[PDB]
Amino acid sequence: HMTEYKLVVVGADGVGKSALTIQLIQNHFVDEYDPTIEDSYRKQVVIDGETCLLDILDTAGQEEYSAMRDQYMRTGEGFLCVFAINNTKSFEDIHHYREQIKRVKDSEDVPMVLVGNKSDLPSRTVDTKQAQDLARSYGIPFIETSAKTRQGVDDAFYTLVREIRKHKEK
């Protein structure tokens, strides 16, 4: 039997939340995924010898949350907080995503990974050292990813699983 891990992917629209999830699930890069589609996905994967069933919500927009999105924020075990390395505003807005998670959990100790996506693109406006400074302040890992090439994608999700295990018995 399989251990469930409930993961939530958050961040500004346009950063690659959906592309990252689709790369993890389907091993393909999608270049035009509807920016409004929000849904949950499953993936069976062995991580460090444990058969895991990941339960992943790919969040979209900031319209009135569905009961499902509210449920995933409340009961989610770990969060991928995504910005794009060519989107300075998305990096600046990570603060707000962190603050939301801390409020929902009433805690500063929540399993989380800072993800800098679109690492394949040449227009880098967020330096790795800026992201490292932010992640160090929050006490969380920082991983750069490309949903296009798959670089870092498994790393980001597996690291989030490992961060959940560091926080609680699973």
Say if residues 157 and 54 touch (Cβ distance below 8 Å).
yes
DSSP structure string for 65-109: PPHHHHHHHHH--EEEEEEETT-HHHHHTHHHHHHHHHHHHT-S-
Choose one: 62-70, 71-79, 122-130, 144-152; the region binding ligand GDP (CB under 6 A): 144-152
Binding mask 6-35 for Mg ion (x = CB under 5 A): -----------xx-----------------
- 37 to each of 7, 32, 61, 149, 165, how far by Cα in Å? 17, 12, 9, 23, 29
Cβ proximity to Mg ion, 37 vs 121, nearer residue? 37
Angle between helix axes 67-75 and 94-105 (nearest 10 degrees) is: 80
- Decide: is 147 part of the binding site for ligand GDP (CB under 6 A): yes
Question: How many CA within 13 A on the CB side of residue 26?
Answer: 11
The CB-nearest residue to Mg ion is 18
Q: Which two tokens stand for residue 137?
A: 């302040």
- Decide: is 39 part of the binding site for ligand GDP (CB under 6 A): no
Q: Which amino acid is at 3?
A: T
**In angstroms, what is the minimal distance from the CB of 91 to Mg ion?**
18
Cβ proximity to ligand GDP, 2 vs 61, nearer residue? 61
- Interacting residues with ligand GDP between 6 and 35 (CB under 6 A): 13-19, 31-33, 35
Number of residues that bind ligand GDP (CB under 6 A): 18
User: Which residues of this chain interact with ligand GDP, rule CB under 6 A?
Assistant: 13-19, 31-33, 35, 117-118, 120-121, 146-148
